[PDB]
Symmetry: C3
Subunit: 149 residues, 3 copies
């Protein structure tokens, strides 16, 4: 269990370094500390060298306008910034630019496992969405492998 | 320890399904990620079939107006919405309607234990309170058992 | 590992009770549930009897104005409020008063370890910063020991 997570962490770090990764989200996180589960099939961030896709779509039991949200941006990846601390925690940012729409992305990975948290900020208003899930190399991602891109 | 939590989870799930449960809170959670402890005797959500009671009352060392809060609503339970993911995480919402006052409730339970987080939204303003604690069947709740309702 | 944290907790509690402690922060916490790592050398709260110093300075990969912040206040400690629950969790507040500037501090310590979370609220605007890290007695703090105060 501990060795299984440690290898996943190494794989996640190598995937970030290759710029070939998918964050497959399984929950949305709310400002008050609450969470709700979401489907990974339409909640992910995929980066494959200079191209990327973010898709978010949740319709949850969290009542009211904050419990439903989403965006899709498919295009080019730019402005990659990365920092790693002495413990192996990674903080990374980048933007995905589509046609008439973009999203700014901030991703954090804690040492020891491949759970990562991502904040997605679309360009059209000041609101953002924060999700968490598994950071995977492309070849271990069912999202990546389930279609021809 | 692991088997003790697993049974508590099963008990919590059966209690939600019976609509006979109490969430006994032991902390209040703040938007900035802070917490403060609270007394369970006046910080709970009780549902017993079509009737329910929410009582929240905290007066904490968290400085300023956000560190003190509360509401009491005693009445009928309505609009129950429930969803369960493939991992056994549960997201649930409902309202408690009193006389001239109501509260909308959102409750989440993670698989493997009976710790749950609840957000309480009274009808009179847009503010909300988020607490966490133990989700219990009525017959295991000292809140339920300590008085005749 | 469990006994190592338990002793650290006892040491942290004795340090708070002596009013001789340093919280050495290693991350900043964001309202959306994100975190970013920070350097401890300029991110700490030191209390030594009636005198204290808070220094915060982070310049992180979290994009935009919320990912950079800081304050330094060096002066006197006042208005100490402390509460401890039946489980050994501690919630504490106090202010550090400098010349023309002050900060209100809220610190929480969970039983069983010396990880603590602190919120710092400078007097000049309504914004605040929340960080987490290790709560240490003065004689175990490299911050304290690295200079003559
Ligand atoms: Mg936006
Ligand atoms: Mg309200
Ligand atoms: Mg302030």
């Amino acid at each position: 269990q501990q060795a299984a997570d440690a290898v996943s962490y190494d794989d996640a770090v190598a995937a970030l370094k290759a710029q070939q990764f998918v964050l497959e989200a399984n929950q949305v996180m709310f400002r008050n500390g609450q969470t709700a589960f979401v489907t990974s099939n339409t909640n992910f961030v995929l980066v494959n060298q200079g191209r990327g896709t973010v898709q978010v779509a949740f319709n949850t039991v969290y009542p009211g306008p904050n419990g439903i949200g989403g965006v899709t941006v498919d295009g080019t990846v730019s402005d990659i910034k990365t920092s790693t601390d002495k413990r192996g925690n990674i903080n990374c940012s980048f933007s995905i630019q589509g046609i008439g729409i973009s999203a700014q992305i901030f991703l954090t990975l804690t040492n020891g496992d491949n759970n990562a948290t991502v904040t997605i900020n679309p360009n059209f208003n000041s609101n953002t969405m924060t999700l968490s899930g598994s950071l995977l190399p492309l070849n271990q991602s069912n999202i990546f492998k389930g279609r021809s891109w």
